Amino acid sequence: SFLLSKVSFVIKKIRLEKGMTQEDLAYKSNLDRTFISGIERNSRNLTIKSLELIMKGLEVSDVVFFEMLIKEILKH
Amino acid sequence: MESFLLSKVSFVIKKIRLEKGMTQEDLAYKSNLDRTFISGIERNSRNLTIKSLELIMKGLEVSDVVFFEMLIKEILKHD
Ligand code: NA
C-alpha cells in the first residue's frame, strides 16, 4: 500500500519532531505500543478512527496532517 | 460522540461518488467491495482501513492528492 507507507511516515515524522517516543504516543492515543511500532514499520493496516486517535495524541490539526501527507505524496 | 474524521471521510466519498454519476452499487462494483459496506460507510456506521480507502479512490477514479484536497476543504467549511 503506497498510501499506508505515506501515512505511516508522516506519523513518525511528527512524533519525532515532538520528541515523543512510541510509548509516549501509545499512551496519549490510547493505543497499544506494539500497534504504534507496527504502524511505523509499515506492517499494520490502520483505520480512519485509529488515525484520528493518533492525530489527537500528536496534537496535530487534521488539516495540517493532510497537508503534510499531500507534500509527502508529491515527493513521488 | 461519533468520529469527526470518519464522518468527513464518509461525506467526501459520497460527494465524489455523486459527482461521478455513480450509485452505491456502482462504487462497490468498481472498488471490489461489498455494497453493504459502501452503504454503511455513507451512513457513518462503518470504519474503514487506509487500504479500503485506496480501493474506494480507485473505484472513484480520483487521485490520493485530489481526495485529500477535497477532505481539507470539507473540514475547513465545517465550522
Ligand atoms: Na462511516
Numbering used by the authors:
A (entry chain D): 3 to 78
B (entry chain A): 1 to 79
Q: What does the paper behind this entry write?
A:
The most widespread of these mechanisms employs a “controller” (C) protein encoded by a gene downstream of its own promoter, and usually co-transcribed with the endonuclease (R) gene as a single transcriptional unit. The C-protein binds at various sites within the C/R promoter to regulate transcription of its own gene and the associated endonuclease gene. Unusually, in the RM system Esp1396I, the C-protein also represses the MTase (M) gene by binding to the promoter at the transcriptional start site, denoted OM where the C/R genes and the M gene are transcribed convergently from different promoters. Flexibility in this loop is very important for DNA sequence recognition, as it has been observed in the nucleoprotein structures to adopt different conformations depending on which operator site the protein is bound to.
Of the mutant proteins, Y37F showed the strongest binding to the OM site, followed by S52A and Y37A. SPR analysis showed that Y37F formed much more stable complexes with the OM operator site than Y37A, with KDs of 1.8 and 5.5 nM respectively, but both were less stable than the wild type (KD = 0.51 nM). This indicated that the role of the tyrosine was more than just the formation of a hydrogen bond with the DNA backbone, but also involved the phenyl ring common to both tyrosine and phenylalanine. For the hydroxyl group only, the ΔΔG between the wild type and Y37F mutant was found to be −3.1 kJ mol−1 (−1.55 kJ mol−1 per hydrogen bond). The free protein structures of the wild type, Y37F and Y37A mutants showed no major structural differences either in the local binding regions in terms of helix or side chain positions, or in the overall fold. The Y37F crystal structure has six monomers (three biological dimers) in the asymmetric unit. Five of the monomers in the asymmetric unit are observed to be in loop conformation I but the sixth more closely resembles that of conformation II, which is almost identical to that in the DNA-protein complex with the 19OM operator site. Despite Y37F and T36A only crystallising in the presence of SO4, this anion was not visible in either electron density map. As with the high-resolution wild type structure, the C-terminal tail is also involved in several crystal contacts with multiple monomers in the T36A, Y37F and trigonal R46A structures.
